[PDB]
Design a protein around this ligand. Structure first.
Ligand SMILES: [Cl-]
Ligand SMILES: [Cl-]
Lengths: 303, 303
């Protein structure tokens, strides 16, 4: 009659070892030693209850974090993709910028060699204009000297025309003798007049002509302004180029420093890719680790 | 009577097991009586529990691990996220100083282009001016040629007047003193004719000088003409070249704008990951906590 209860308690233990936690523990009301032991066992049953409970909450917590890492992961993923896409868009561009910079530098270096060329052919043309200016001055002098001497020949004609008067008057001193004389004096007069005609034609021609040299002189002189002016505008072109070259090998070393920061960045993007794959693996591992913990106490029927 | 000692003892064994203490073997398994059966029962439970405990201990250690891994995984990410921020700094800075120089270029191109075109207009007006000179020279020269032809008539007349007067003088002084009078007049005509012939030679040789200088000068302005031609086609080439730089600098500034935008896109990303960094420090601390709860749920803690 002690046999019956302690066997019953033994069964109770068994029933607990199978994970049956919800059944009452018998004999807790006895005030004999059996009661002490039943109480011990009810205490066991309670202590197991709380443990399964804790483990189960632990499993569900972790299943929660697994799920949270996961969705935090799926973000960093497509967000990291976005980054690598953005990063190639900027790689593409820095390649175009080196292309365009290198070209602009050669294109400046051309213009410069080209302008110095204009400069040097303008200076040569400068010196050829000098010579022309000079030779115009000479022509101007010669031409005035011609005006001068032709006016003298007009004088002589006038004068020899006057002597024809005297020769006529000296001829008529022997009428019938100075008849031939009279003809000569006539001839002289005729020769003077034609000779004056020629003189005056030349006056017209030479005065006109003098007009022309002075005009041609101002034209040639301006042709020299022109050379000076070109040289000037073409030099300022050469400077402008010196400056473009300087801002180009400048842009060159700045593109350069950017390509470097970009290598940095696709290195870190690459790593974020790695981090993502790993983080997915961690999540999976956590999920299964909660599965195992749940399974470890799942036979237990509680409360 | 006697057998209340093992009752109490078993009670104590059960309180150890409840307390999380499993290492002690249960006594009284050797009895044939009912106690023995129960001691065996406690033994079966003890050993089942050791096993359940151990999976759970293993569970938590795996969480502790997982967590501190996620943690270090997250410290690297943090330092790559500042490293990324700092890189994106330099980049933005470099686009700044490179957006400056692209503008400086479009300006200096514009400014060169004008200078070139300015010389182009000049060297072209220049060519029109050289043309006018070559024409004036032809004028000057046609005229001199005309003057030559007439000067020659004045020479002719001088010649004729010389002979006319020399014959008249001769035939008058032949008459004695009766024709001394005429002889002197004829004589002064001969001298006047001599002067006039000499004047006309001086003009003839001055005309020679002019014409010669005209041909020469004319050949020289021709070449000046062709040097302005050469300049035009040079500066024109330079104008074309500036066009090509206005281009570069335009597609460049579009390059800066793609990069500008993409650098912003990656500014978003950088800040978002900073969010991720501490969000996940915090997941890692929470995982560490569940591991802790799990080991403590099953520790020998004297509960
Ligand atoms: Cl450039
Ligand atoms: Cl053992």
């Amino acid at each position: 009659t002690i046999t019956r209860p302690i066997i019953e308690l033994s069964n109770t233990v068994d029933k607990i070892a199978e994970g049956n936690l919800e059944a009452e523990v018998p004999h807790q009301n006895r005030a004999d030693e059996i009661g002490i032991l039943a109480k011990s066992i009810e205490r066991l049953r309670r202590s197991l209850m709380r443990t399964v409970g804790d483990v189960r909450n632990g499993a569900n917590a972790i299943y929660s974090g697994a799920s949270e890492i996961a969705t935090g992961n799926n973000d960093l993923s497509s967000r990291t993709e976005q980054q690598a896409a953005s990063l190639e868009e900027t790689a593409a561009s820095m390649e175009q910028l080196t292309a365009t910079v290198k070209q602009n530098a050669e294109n400046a270096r051309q213009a410069s060699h080209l302008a110095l060329s204009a400069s040097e052919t303008a200076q040569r043309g400068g010196k050829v204009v000098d010579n022309v200016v000079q030779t115009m001055r000479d022509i101007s002098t010669s031409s005035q000297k011609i005006a001068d001497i032709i006016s003298v020949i007009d004088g002589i004609a006038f004068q020899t025309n006057i002597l024809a008067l005297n020769a006529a008057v000296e001829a008529a001193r022997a009428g019938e003798q100075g008849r031939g004389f009279a003809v000569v004096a006539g001839e002289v007069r005729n020769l003077a007049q034609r000779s004056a005609q020629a003189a005056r034609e030349i006056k017209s021609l030479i005065e006109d002509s003098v007009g022309k040299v002075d005009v041609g002189s101002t034209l040639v002189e301006s042709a020299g302004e022109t050379m000076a002016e070109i040289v000037s505008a073409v030099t300022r072109v050469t400077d402008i180029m010196g400056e473009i070259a300087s801002a180009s090998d400048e842009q060159s070393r700045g593109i350069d420093q950017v390509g470097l920061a970009v290598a940095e960045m696709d290195r870190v993007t690459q790593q974020n890719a790695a981090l993502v794959e790993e983080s997915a693996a961690a999540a999976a591992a956590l999920e299964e680790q909660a599965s195992r913990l749940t399974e470890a106490v799942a036979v237990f029927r509680i409360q």
